[PDB]
Amino acid sequence: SGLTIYFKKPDSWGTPHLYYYDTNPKVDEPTWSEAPEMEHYEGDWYTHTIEGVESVRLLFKDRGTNQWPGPGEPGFFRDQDGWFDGEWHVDRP
């Protein structure tokens, strides 16, 4: 299985990282500061695949203090791929 997630980077952000927890099925889960670099995709879009996973809660961050959603707010729940530009889409919008 595995979730591919694409994320449109806000202009003022550094390169996005994907933080995730509540993996199902359970898979290794990085620390906030060790959340992985999303690979550059096309233009503003970046991407990362969580291996081994049907569902996840996730937050986007950079190496700075930016994150979406806010500090402490629950991760976005996916399900399925994958495109977030401020709202979620099954296809590139």
Ligand X SMILES: OC[C@H]1O[C@H](O[C@H]2[C@H](O)[C@@H](O)[C@@H](O)O[C@@H]2CO)[C@H](O)[C@@H](O)[C@@H]1O
Q: Using CB under 6 A, list all residues that contact ligand X.
A: 21, 32, 59, 67, 71-75
Rounded to whole angstroms, how far apart are CA atoms 20 and 85?
A: 18
Helices (H) and strands (E) in the chain, counts: 0, 9
Task: Pick between residue 12 and residue 31 the one whose CB is nearest to ligand X.
Answer: 31
In angstroms, give the least distance from the CB of 13 to ligand X.
15
Q: Which residue is nearest to ligand X (CB)?
A: 71
In angstroms, give the least distance from the CB of 33 to ligand X.
8
Task: Pick between residue 30 and residue 93 the one whose CB is nearest to ligand X.
Answer: 30
∠ CA 45-14-2, nearest 5°, is: 45
CB 4 within 8 A of CB 48: yes
In angstroms, give the least distance from the CB of 23 to ligand X.
11
